[PDB]
Design an enzyme around this catalytic site. Structure first.
Site, short mmCIF file in Angstrom:
data_model
loop_
_atom_site.label_atom_id
_atom_site.label_comp_id
_atom_site.label_asym_id
_atom_site.label_seq_id
_atom_site.Cartn_x
_atom_site.Cartn_y
_atom_site.Cartn_z
N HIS A 22 54.10 55.74 46.74
CA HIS A 22 54.03 57.19 46.87
C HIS A 22 55.33 57.88 47.29
N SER B 113 56.27 56.51 40.55
CA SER B 113 56.37 55.49 39.53
C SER B 113 57.68 55.63 38.78
N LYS C 240 43.24 58.25 30.74
CA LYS C 240 43.95 57.19 30.04
C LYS C 240 43.56 55.86 30.72
N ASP C 241 43.38 55.88 32.04
CA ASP C 241 42.97 54.68 32.78
C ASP C 241 41.58 54.22 32.31
N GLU D 125 43.14 24.87 37.99
CA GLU D 125 42.87 26.18 37.42
C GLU D 125 44.08 26.60 36.57
C1 HEC Z 1 31.61 36.54 50.84
C2 HEC Z 1 32.26 37.45 49.98
C3 HEC Z 1 33.21 37.05 49.07
C4 HEC Z 1 34.34 37.74 48.81
C5 HEC Z 1 34.78 39.02 49.62
C6 HEC Z 1 35.01 37.05 47.73
N1 HEC Z 1 34.32 35.91 47.39
FE1 HEC Z 1 34.88 34.50 46.07
N2 HEC Z 1 33.21 33.50 46.45
C7 HEC Z 1 32.23 33.80 47.36
C8 HEC Z 1 31.16 32.83 47.31
C9 HEC Z 1 29.84 32.93 48.09
C10 HEC Z 1 31.54 31.90 46.39
C11 HEC Z 1 30.71 30.70 45.96
C12 HEC Z 1 29.83 31.01 44.76
C13 HEC Z 1 30.57 30.86 43.46
O1 HEC Z 1 30.95 29.73 43.14
O2 HEC Z 1 30.79 31.85 42.74
C14 HEC Z 1 32.82 32.31 45.88
C15 HEC Z 1 33.58 31.58 44.97
C16 HEC Z 1 34.84 31.93 44.49
C17 HEC Z 1 35.56 31.18 43.48
C18 HEC Z 1 35.02 30.01 42.71
C19 HEC Z 1 34.43 30.44 41.36
C20 HEC Z 1 33.63 29.32 40.71
O3 HEC Z 1 34.16 28.62 39.83
O4 HEC Z 1 32.46 29.14 41.09
C21 HEC Z 1 36.73 31.82 43.28
C22 HEC Z 1 37.81 31.36 42.32
C23 HEC Z 1 36.69 33.03 44.07
N3 HEC Z 1 35.54 33.06 44.83
C24 HEC Z 1 37.65 34.04 44.04
C25 HEC Z 1 37.59 35.22 44.77
C26 HEC Z 1 38.60 36.24 44.77
C27 HEC Z 1 39.92 36.11 43.98
C28 HEC Z 1 38.16 37.21 45.63
C29 HEC Z 1 38.66 38.45 46.06
C30 HEC Z 1 39.83 39.08 45.59
C31 HEC Z 1 36.92 36.75 46.20
N4 HEC Z 1 36.57 35.55 45.65
C32 HEC Z 1 36.20 37.44 47.15
C33 HEC Z 1 32.24 34.91 48.19
C34 HEC Z 1 33.21 35.90 48.20
C1 HEC Z 2 55.03 40.98 42.52
C2 HEC Z 2 54.75 42.33 42.30
C3 HEC Z 2 53.53 43.04 42.42
C4 HEC Z 2 52.26 42.62 42.63
C5 HEC Z 2 51.69 41.20 42.64
C6 HEC Z 2 51.44 43.80 42.76
N1 HEC Z 2 52.18 44.92 42.42
FE1 HEC Z 2 51.51 46.79 42.08
N2 HEC Z 2 53.35 47.41 41.62
C7 HEC Z 2 54.49 46.63 41.63
C8 HEC Z 2 55.65 47.44 41.31
C9 HEC Z 2 57.10 47.02 41.38
C10 HEC Z 2 55.20 48.67 41.00
C11 HEC Z 2 56.05 49.83 40.52
C12 HEC Z 2 55.87 49.94 39.01
C13 HEC Z 2 56.80 50.96 38.40
O1 HEC Z 2 56.69 52.16 38.71
O2 HEC Z 2 57.66 50.56 37.60
C14 HEC Z 2 53.76 48.65 41.17
C15 HEC Z 2 52.92 49.71 40.93
C16 HEC Z 2 51.55 49.70 41.15
C17 HEC Z 2 50.65 50.77 40.79
C18 HEC Z 2 51.07 52.01 40.02
C19 HEC Z 2 50.65 51.97 38.55
C20 HEC Z 2 51.27 50.81 37.79
O3 HEC Z 2 50.52 49.89 37.38
O4 HEC Z 2 52.51 50.81 37.62
C21 HEC Z 2 49.43 50.42 41.25
C22 HEC Z 2 48.12 51.21 41.21
C23 HEC Z 2 49.55 49.09 41.80
N3 HEC Z 2 50.85 48.64 41.66
C24 HEC Z 2 48.48 48.32 42.27
C25 HEC Z 2 48.53 46.98 42.62
C26 HEC Z 2 47.40 46.19 43.06
C27 HEC Z 2 45.99 46.76 43.28
C28 HEC Z 2 47.83 44.90 43.16
C29 HEC Z 2 47.17 43.70 43.42
C30 HEC Z 2 46.02 43.44 44.25
C31 HEC Z 2 49.24 44.91 42.88
N4 HEC Z 2 49.65 46.18 42.53
C32 HEC Z 2 50.07 43.81 42.99
C33 HEC Z 2 54.54 45.28 41.91
C34 HEC Z 2 53.47 44.47 42.26
C1 LIG Z 3 52.09 56.60 41.09
O1 LIG Z 3 51.21 55.96 40.14
C2 LIG Z 3 49.77 55.68 40.07
C3 LIG Z 3 48.98 55.76 41.31
O2 LIG Z 3 49.54 56.10 42.38
C4 LIG Z 3 47.53 55.49 41.31
C5 LIG Z 3 46.86 55.63 42.69
C6 LIG Z 3 46.85 55.13 40.15
C7 LIG Z 3 45.24 54.83 40.14
C8 LIG Z 3 44.79 53.51 40.68
C9 LIG Z 3 44.34 53.18 41.95
C10 LIG Z 3 44.22 54.25 43.07
C11 LIG Z 3 43.89 51.77 42.41
C12 LIG Z 3 43.44 51.76 43.87
C13 LIG Z 3 42.55 50.76 44.38
C14 LIG Z 3 42.01 50.60 45.65
C15 LIG Z 3 42.31 51.58 46.83
C16 LIG Z 3 41.06 49.50 46.08
C17 LIG Z 3 40.71 49.35 47.54
C18 LIG Z 3 39.81 48.26 47.63
C19 LIG Z 3 38.61 47.93 48.20
C20 LIG Z 3 38.07 46.52 47.94
C21 LIG Z 3 37.69 48.77 49.09
C22 LIG Z 3 36.72 47.97 49.98
C23 LIG Z 3 35.27 48.08 49.70
C24 LIG Z 3 34.19 47.90 50.55
C25 LIG Z 3 34.35 47.52 52.06
C26 LIG Z 3 32.72 48.09 50.14
C27 LIG Z 3 32.16 47.23 49.05
C28 LIG Z 3 30.89 46.67 49.51
C29 LIG Z 3 29.59 47.19 49.52
C30 LIG Z 3 29.26 48.60 49.01
C31 LIG Z 3 28.32 46.42 50.04
C32 LIG Z 3 26.96 47.18 49.95
C33 LIG Z 3 25.76 46.46 50.50
C34 LIG Z 3 24.36 46.62 50.32
C35 LIG Z 3 23.27 45.76 50.97
C36 LIG Z 3 23.71 47.67 49.43
C37 LIG Z 3 47.64 55.04 38.86
O3 LIG Z 3 47.07 54.72 37.78
C38 LIG Z 3 49.13 55.32 38.88
O4 LIG Z 3 49.78 55.22 37.65
C39 LIG Z 3 50.90 55.97 37.20
#
Ligand code: HEC
Ligand code: HEC
Ligand SMILES: COc1c(O)c(C)c(C/C=C(\C)CC/C=C(\C)CC/C=C(/C)CC/C=C(\C)CC/C=C(\C)CCC=C(C)C)c(O)c1OC
Ligand SMILES: CCCCCCCCCCCCCCCCCC(=O)OC[C@H](COP(=O)([O-])OCC(O)COP(=O)([O-])OC[C@@H](COC(=O)CCCCCCCCCCCCCCCCC)OC(=O)CCCCCCCCCCCCCCCCC)OC(=O)CCCCCCCCCCCCCCCCC
Ligand SMILES: CCCCCCCCCCCCCCCCCC(=O)OC[C@H](COP(=O)([O-])OCC(O)COP(=O)([O-])OC[C@@H](COC(=O)CCCCCCCCCCCCCCCCC)OC(=O)CCCCCCCCCCCCCCCCC)OC(=O)CCCCCCCCCCCCCCCCC
Ligand SMILES: CCCCCCCCCCCCCCCCCC(=O)OC[C@H](COP(=O)([O-])OCC[N+](C)(C)C)OC(=O)CCCCCCCCCCCCCCCCC
Ligand SMILES: CCCCCCCCCCCCCCCCCC(=O)OC[C@H](COP(=O)([O-])OCC[N+](C)(C)C)OC(=O)CCCCCCCCCCCCCCCCC
Ligand code: HEC
Ligand code: HEC
Ligand code: HEC
Ligand SMILES: COc1c(O)c(C)c(C/C=C(\C)CC/C=C(\C)CC/C=C(/C)CC/C=C(\C)CC/C=C(\C)CCC=C(C)C)c(O)c1OC
Ligand SMILES: CCCCCCCC1=C(O)C(=O)c2scnc2C1=O
Lengths: 246, 125, 93, 55, 385, 385, 93
Positions: free
Chosen positions: F202, F206, F228-229, F272
């Site tokens: 921010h 970008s 567009k997203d 993997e």
């Molecule tokens: C408790 C909440 C929870 C979160 C938060 C969560 N996981 Fe998991 N994940 C699990 C559980 C439960 C399993 C076992 C069940 C399964 O195999 O899918 C699992 C299994 C996995 C596996 C094994 C998949 C397979 O082959 O069965 C991978 C890889 C994985 N998680 C990746 C992720 C990633 C990457 C994220 C987040 C960015 C994430 N998980 C977040 C609960 C979670």
């Molecule tokens: C190793 C590098 C790297 C990783 C991994 C990374 N980012 Fe970024 N991200 C960047 C860079 C650098 C930019 C600036 C892009 C530009 O403006 O040229 C960016 C920009 C962004 C933007 C702006 C839109 C875009 O795509 O350009 C978003 C939203 C964003 N990242 C989200 C994420 C999220 C969510 C994750 C993962 C959980 C992530 N990034 C992981 C490097 C990274």
């Molecule tokens: C400057 O440039 C930009 C730019 O700034 C942005 C913001 C975007 C748009 C993209 C984004 C904003 C991505 C952002 C993503 C996040 C903030 C993700 C945050 C992540 C989370 C995982 C939130 C956490 C969630 C929880 C704790 C709740 C989930 C669980 C629940 C609801 C359980 C409910 C249970 C029961 C029993 C009902 C662009 O495309 C872009 O391009 C030019």
């Protein structure tokens, strides 16, 4: 609620382990174990206690090993698949008198003798209650009490009617350390041993507590002094007003 | 609650000799128990200012009163933080505890109320 | 950045208060002050004052609630004793 | 207090000297406590009971 | 400018913890907030370490907690810290809330600040309860049963929501396992909510005991309040230490050292001390639906205070009638708690009903009436015409 | 002003999602970021719902996943979504990273933005791995064994850190249970890290495909880029749907449908797909210590790029030599992956060793050399003296 | 609020670019434009152009890597067949 329903309040006996700086009496724990084995174990299990936890607490490594081996546990199946037994080892948990809940009730008029592992923490009154219950069986119930068949009267138990009869009688145990095995002496012992079963960390917990409380106390006092110093300029600050002319 | 409303009720009581002799003595006792005077404050200094009416009022307040309000408020905070009270000879006297901001507050409320009235006037043909 | 909404608090240099003039403050370094020990003899009889003015607002409501509790408790005890089993059948159901 | 000015001389104590002192304190304090504690409960401990036993 | 000001991350820390302008006169009642953050951390840290040794299955839950108590090195310290910490979390929250009530912290322009705080309170109650169910003792099982049944009061679908929540015929293995999953999740939602609370606090700043503006004399958060916060942090730790090492089970219930039993409900059920006032309110209404509605209303009524406080000044510092009634409210709350620990018997039921009345009347009748009267008294005591 | 601007909470949303000024020319490569947020949500949501039915005990873990597959309504959809989602999470991350590499997104003044991104990548690898261990299949057990052993390479204490991490003599019941606790925790740390990533983005905004300033012609995030997203969000979902319903196990390993066995390691182990390039690098060094150091360095070397890129212009759009070498690097990475899926046999070992060399040489030799040469070419092609 | 660090991007009205003058933009409402269908006949032969300029930078490095892979693979196959068990003992250990 009527007193008979709540149960007679257990009084406060002077346990040697009461007090921030006091450890259990390990001799008493030792004796208590014997009373448990010779009297209580007949109907009460102690499922959560492992043989190894006795070592260095109330018995030697050797003594516990001998005790555990007198019992049999299921071993891993042989080269052919047929099941086989095995003597006990330190890793095992003290075995109970019954194989299941149904057999436990069958042997007790239908009542279930609870597991004593946590009994001291699972009842208001703790040690005072257990001791009082054990030594509080009157020879005859108070006048007017219609005691159900198979039950017993004890004032400390809620509702007065308990399914456990008096089991401690003078000299029914021959204490290995020579101590006179009176009913009160034995109750005093098992209870102490039962307290240890429920709170094995007791002695150690209180030692760590003494360290923790001394440091935090000191830190607390020190912070006050530091705060006052850091604030002195603001605290003694002084103002004066001189009305500006128009 | 608006100051226009407080004045209406307060003035009605103040005029009638029935309530005026019954209430005022209680009110005077209340004000002394409040203790704000022992901190060097005038009641008007205590009015919560975070709203438009009070901001307009404080803006219209003449310079000399404004500098004085400022000194009283700062002096109060300092005494409070020391957990003391001002020496008795510095306490605000009853003669001094005058509603100096009140006239500005009431003027602003009437101006505000008029605008509210005019923005919503209906018309009958 | 994006425009921000108006508040009732600013920051150093533009806090939002009225223009000050005529007021003069004075202070002495904590380093030059008497080491913390003088908070007695001069600051002891002065203390406890900020509770002699308040305890009534706390004591009366406390007292009221303590007696109300004690009364109802003693009444309960009586109702469930032998002496009160008669009145108990009256007030109960 | 001139006792302070001999070791640190009008300057505060630095992190290094603090950390170093902390490691020393941790050991000394623990021994002092375990000692006092065991002495207070003399006769009740397993150590004491093991002596009165012969097998 | 200084690096702490220019860096994107450090400036946040600088504006909230270092250079934040605080009113020079705030007292120790303003130290509860930091104490609440500390509590939140202690709960999360000790919880994750225990989660490493905990099993959520209904056949293993109780024993896995015993395993944490007997086998895990320093395990009992973790459990007693987590358990006693929850209680301390509520003691401090009530003081934080009471402080707000007394000083008119809920007033404009801090309404948003107050409303977010109410949401946090609700989320905290839900969190502690779910944690309570994870022990799967006698109290756990029945609590899980009662609270989930609270939803059957909803007309038509109510009993469905319940069988849904249970994941079966009754509180069973699908229940406790989902409760553990949920107990882990909610604390992170509280954290996010705590950030929004702080954002709302930052726009207008803290109030002060005088109830007036602080803009004429502020001092930096850094040094002054960082070190003052340290004083209560240590005092808080000393007291928690005394319970953890010397009296770990005083704030708990013996019935929870007995494994849950679907067929037997304990002869005497006394909920967690911090839920007692609400338990008493529930018990005082001889109707199912109305009973649960009034209990929930006991919490939501906190939202009404910014509108029913008719005063023209913020806080009870200079208000005789308000201070007096403030304490009637406080001790009435404690009384409700005492009633909750008693049996549903004669003098108690009526006392419970009157106390409940008083609780709601404070917000809806007493405050608006008293504040109006005080406004007038303030006026007629100085105007000479 | 508009309410979306004045409200404390809405202004954050307004500045980041609605009024944020975007460079008019950004292409679909800039859509990966939002796709990464979506992935993070899908992983957290499906994970919590499965956690409700999962048991971490080593004797029940495998069967509880089968229970989720066979008994839980829509259970297989949850597992296949979570599992296939992890893969899609990496496919999109690589494209996000590659996009940054190609356009010089890592350059000043976005260094902080790039460094936080590297941290996120590491946290994601750690998260997926821990999740992988929770299935407790054959691959799970050995993976948990290998990765934890990675630490024994540390001199002196190394084997201690390992027995500590295991909580015993080998990968056992204390291991898998702590891994589950940890798998749940880390995703919330990634979320917080994602917020810091966005904060850093921010301050300067970008970049764009031309590599120059965007300050002369920006258009609002709202409407243009929100819609567009949406285009790529739906395309992303369509493809994920095809794997989840029609080919759920194509990106997995058959050995994970076999319960873990402490005494037998599979005859053919293929990690993997997204870890293969790193597995190949590890395998290419015939020394234990040097093997793990070089693998970790394969990730940390990403930090060096802002300093070794000697160019005077941002990005490869107008650079012949850089575009060419950029693709050598891309396909070299894919090759490393292919080598990782093969047996340690003759033509492959040497190919693996050369590819590893090329990988590191890109960052340390090729980029600095090429960028310097290109700088000079740009100059002498226009200066007439 | 607290003072903010200098950046290379501002906001609407003070974006940070140079003063513009002389440039005039024109646009027509999307509502008045031909419904999406004209992206053919006029916008079809023009397309695919932004890949005829790039494919070489992608194809050559791809080609190089594909042949390298195919070569080593076919060699592996030979080494482990009957015909190559002799050369296998030579290159192996
Ligand atoms: C408790 C909440 C929870 C979160 C938060 C969560 N996981 Fe998991 N994940 C699990 C559980 C439960 C399993 C076992 C069940 C399964 O195999 O899918 C699992 C299994 C996995 C596996 C094994 C998949 C397979 O082959 O069965 C991978 C890889 C994985 N998680 C990746 C992720 C990633 C990457 C994220 C987040 C960015 C994430 N998980 C977040 C609960 C979670
Ligand atoms: C190793 C590098 C790297 C990783 C991994 C990374 N980012 Fe970024 N991200 C960047 C860079 C650098 C930019 C600036 C892009 C530009 O403006 O040229 C960016 C920009 C962004 C933007 C702006 C839109 C875009 O795509 O350009 C978003 C939203 C964003 N990242 C989200 C994420 C999220 C969510 C994750 C993962 C959980 C992530 N990034 C992981 C490097 C990274
Ligand atoms: C400057 O440039 C930009 C730019 O700034 C942005 C913001 C975007 C748009 C993209 C984004 C904003 C991505 C952002 C993503 C996040 C903030 C993700 C945050 C992540 C989370 C995982 C939130 C956490 C969630 C929880 C704790 C709740 C989930 C669980 C629940 C609801 C359980 C409910 C249970 C029961 C029993 C009902 C662009 O495309 C872009 O391009 C030019
Ligand atoms: C089974 C039921 C069990 C119940 C469990 C108990 C619940 C515990 C949970 C929470 C515990 C941690 C909370 C600590 C803070 C809470 C107290 C508080 O906010 O009071 C502010 C209140 C406001 O003070 P102030 O106006 O800002 O102070 C001017 C100071 O003199 C300005 O002076 P100063 O800064 O220069 O120095 C100030 C002072 C600061 O001292 C402090 O530590 C801060 C204030 C604490 C007062 C003591 C509270 C008692 C708690 C027990 O230091 C002192 O010298 C005072 C010493 C006071 C004695 C403390 C007790 C030692 C006990 C050892 C064990 O302090 C009090 O007057 C306390 C009133 C008592 C309230 C009790 C109600 C709670 C029930
Ligand atoms: C066992 C291995 C399995 C492999 C698994 C595959 C991995 C999948 C994971 C990720 C999947 C979701 C990711 C979607 C986005 C990724 C593509 C991307 O970023 O390309 C940008 C790239 C940049 O475009 P631009 O310069 O900003 O666009 C000017 C447009 O004409 C400006 O025009 P517009 O906005 O007015 O309309 C644009 C366009 C927008 O179309 C889109 O949806 C966006 C771009 C997607 C191109 C197709 C990618 C192929 C993915 C399969 O809509 C169209 O009419 C074009 C239709 C293209 C055909 C899509 C395939 C339909 C397949 C049905 C099944 O679009 C391409 O030229 C794609 C190049 C191919 C790259 C493939 C490398 C990935 C491996
Ligand atoms: C918020 C306001 C707090 C209200 C709570 C005051 C409750 C104190 C009640 C005294 C009592 O009889 O507790 C009995 C209860 C239980 O009594 P009970 O369980 O023994 O009654 C019958 C049961 N048998 C037969 C087994 C004996 O004790 C507790 O669980 C609470 C004690 C701690 C209270 C914590 C307050 C600290 C602040
Ligand atoms: C990042 C770059 C990706 C590199 C990955 C390309 C790997 C494709 C390997 C082809 C192969 O032989 O896979 C065999 C492996 C396994 O071969 P294997 O396990 O059958 O070999 C011997 C084992 N038995 C005896 C049981 C038959 O297949 C996979 O697990 C991966 C296939 C999917 C690859 C995903 C890439 C999508 C993007
Ligand atoms: C079988 C003949 C028993 C022997 C020997 C002892 N106990 Fe027992 N005990 C038994 C029964 C059938 C019951 C159930 C009582 C009921 O009405 O439910 C019990 C119960 C206890 C309890 C729990 C009491 C309570 O408060 O709920 C305790 C504390 C207890 N028993 C202790 C105890 C000890 C220490 C013994 C050896 C000295 C002992 N029991 C022997 C049956 C039998
Ligand atoms: C997984 C992480 C985790 C987090 C985060 C967590 N807990 Fe817990 N909590 C547990 C576990 C595991 C138990 C069961 C062990 C126990 O009884 O202490 C538990 C039990 C509890 C209990 C029962 C205490 C008792 O009597 O045994 C309460 C109450 C509780 N938690 C409150 C909280 C509160 C309040 C918070 C946060 C503000 C919190 N927990 C956060 C894991 C967590
Ligand atoms: C129902 C109300 C309510 C709850 C619950 C609440 N707060 Fe607050 N909080 C307030 C109010 C109102 C203020 C403003 C106090 C003032 O300035 O008068 C405040 C102020 C604060 C402050 C500033 C310092 C202070 O103590 O005055 C902090 C820090 C804070 N809260 C933290 C928290 C945390 C952490 C939690 C709980 C997890 C919490 N609050 C829960 C109402 C609440
Ligand atoms: C205007 O007035 C103010 C004021 O504004 C402030 C800020 C304060 C000071 C107080 C605070 C800032 C309190 C703030 C508290 C928080 C932000 C808490 C946030 C909470 C969290 C729980 C963070 C989350 C933590 C984690 C995800 C990590 C914990 C887990 C770990 C490390 C697991 C490690 C695992 C292994 C295997 C080693 C005042 O005192 C004050 O008074 C006048
Ligand atoms: C704000 C929510 C207040 C919770 C009130 C429910 C209190 C409550 C009951 O009503 C009950 O019958 C049982 S049985 C075991 N525990 C409980 C309990 O906590």
């Amino acid at each position: 609620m009527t007193a008979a329903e709540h149960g007679l309040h257990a009084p406060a006996y002077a346990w040697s382990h009461n007090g921030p700086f006091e450890t259990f009496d390990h001799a008493s724990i030792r004796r208590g174990y014997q009373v448990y084995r010779e009297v209580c174990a007949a109907c009460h299990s102690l499922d959560r206690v492992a043989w190894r936890t006795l070592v260095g607490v109330s018995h030697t490594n050797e003594e516990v090993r001998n005790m555990a081996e007198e019992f049999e546990y299921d071993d891993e199946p042989d080269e052919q698949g047929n099941p086989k037994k095995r003597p006990g080892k330190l890793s095992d948990y003290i075995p109970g008198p019954y194989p299941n809940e149904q057999a436990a009730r069958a042997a007790n008029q239908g009542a279930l003798p609870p597991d004593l592992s946590l009994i001291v923490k699972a009842r208001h009154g703790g040690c005072d209650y257990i001791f009082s219950l054990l030594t509080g069986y009157p020879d005859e119930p108070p006048a007017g009490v219609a005691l159900p068949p198979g039950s017993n009267y004890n004032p400390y138990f809620p509702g007065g009617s308990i399914a456990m009869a008096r089991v401690l009688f003078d000299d029914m145990v021959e204490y290995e350390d020579g101590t006179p095995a009176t009913t009160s002496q034995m109750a005093k012992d098992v209870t102490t041993f039962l307290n240890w079963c429920a709170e094995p960390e007791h002695d150690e917990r209180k030692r760590l507590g003494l360290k923790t409380v001394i440091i935090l106390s000191s830190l607390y006092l020190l912070s006050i002094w530091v705060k006052k110093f850091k604030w002195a300029g603001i605290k003694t600050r002084k103002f004066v007003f001189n009305p500006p002319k128009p | 609650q608006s100051f226009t409303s407080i004045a209406r009720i307060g003035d009605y009581i103040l005029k009638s000799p029935v309530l005026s002799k019954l209430c005022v003595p209680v009110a005077n006792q209340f004000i002394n128990l409040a203790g704000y005077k022992k901190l060097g404050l005038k009641f008007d200094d205590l009015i919560a200012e975070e709203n438009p009416i009070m901001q307009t009022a404080l803006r219209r307040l003449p310079e000399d009163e404004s500098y004085a309000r400022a000194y009283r408020i700062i002096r109060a905070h300092q005494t409070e933080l020391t957990h003391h009270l001002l020496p008795r000879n510095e306490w605000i006297k009853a003669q001094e505890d005058v509603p100096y901001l009140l006239p500005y507050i009431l003027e602003a409320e009437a101006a505000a109320k008029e605008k509210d009235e005019l923005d919503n006037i209906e018309v009958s043909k | 950045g994006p425009p921000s909404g108006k508040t009732y608090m600013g920051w150093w240099g533009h806090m939002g208060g009225p223009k000050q003039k005529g007021i003069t403050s004075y202070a002495v370094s904590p380093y030059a002050q008497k080491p913390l020990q003088g908070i007695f003899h001069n600051a002891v009889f002065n203390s406890f004052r900020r509770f002699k003015s308040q305890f009534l607002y706390v004591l009366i409501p406390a007292g009221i609630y303590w007696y109300w509790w004690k009364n109802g408790n003693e009444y309960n005890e009586f109702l469930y004793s032998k002496a009160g089993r008669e009145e108990l059948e009256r007030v109960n159901v | 207090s001139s006792l302070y000015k001999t070791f640190f001389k009008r300057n505060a104590v630095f992190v290094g000297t603090i950390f170093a002192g902390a490691f020393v304190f941790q050991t000394v304090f623990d021994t002092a406590i375990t000692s006092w504690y065991e002495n207070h409960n003399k006769g009740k401990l397993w150590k004491d009971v093991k002596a009165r036993i012969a097998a | 400018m200084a690096f702490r000001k220019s860096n994107v991350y450090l400036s946040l820390v600088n504006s909230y913890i270092i250079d934040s302008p605080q009113p020079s006169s705030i007292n120790y009642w303003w130290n509860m907030g930091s104490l609440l953050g500390l509590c939140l951390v202690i709960q999360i840290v000790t919880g994750i370490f225990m989660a490493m040794h905990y099993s959520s299955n209904i056949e293993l839950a109780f024993s896995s907690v015993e395993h944490i108590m007997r086998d895990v090195h320093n395990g009992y310290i973790l459990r007693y810290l987590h358990a006693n910490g929850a209680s301390f979390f509520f003691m401090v929250m009530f003081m934080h809330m009471a402080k707000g009530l007394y000083y008119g912290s809920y007033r404009s322009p801090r309404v948003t600040l107050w409303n977010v705080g109410v949401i946090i309170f609700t989320l905290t109650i839900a969190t502690a309860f779910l944690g309570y169910c994870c022990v799967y003792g006698q109290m756990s099982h029945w609590g899980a049963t009662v609270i989930t049944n609270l939803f059957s009061a909803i007309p038509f679908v109510g009993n469905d929501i319940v069988s849904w929540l249970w994941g079966g015929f009754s509180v069973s293995n699908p229940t406790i396992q989902r409760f553990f999953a949920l107990h882990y999740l909610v604390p992170f939602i509280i954290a996010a909510m705590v950030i929004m609370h702080l954002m709302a606090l930052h726009i207008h700043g803290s109030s002060n005991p005088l109830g007036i503006t602080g803009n004429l004399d502020r001092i930096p958060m850094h040094s002054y309040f960082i070190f003052k916060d340290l004083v209560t942090v240590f005092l808080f730790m000393l007291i928690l230490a005394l319970f953890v090492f010397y009296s770990p089970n005083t704030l708990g219930h013996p019935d929870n050292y007995i494994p849950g039993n679907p067929l037997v409900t304990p002869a005497s059920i006394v909920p967690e001390w911090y839920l007692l006032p609400f338990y008493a309110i529930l018990r005082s209404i001889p109707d199912k639906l109305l009973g649960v509605i009034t209990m929930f209303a006991a919490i939501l009524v906190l939202l009404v205070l910014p509108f029913t406080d008719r005063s023209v000044v913020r806080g009870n510092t200079f208000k005789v009638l308000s201070k007096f009634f403030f304490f009637i409210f406080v001790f009435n709350f404690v009384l409700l708690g005492q009633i909750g620990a008693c049996h549903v018997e004669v003098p108690y039921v009526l006392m419970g009903q009157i106390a409940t009345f008083i609780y709601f009347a404070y917000f809806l009748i007493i405050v608006p009436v008293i504040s109006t009267i005080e406004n007038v008294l303030f006026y007629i005591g100085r105007v000479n015409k």
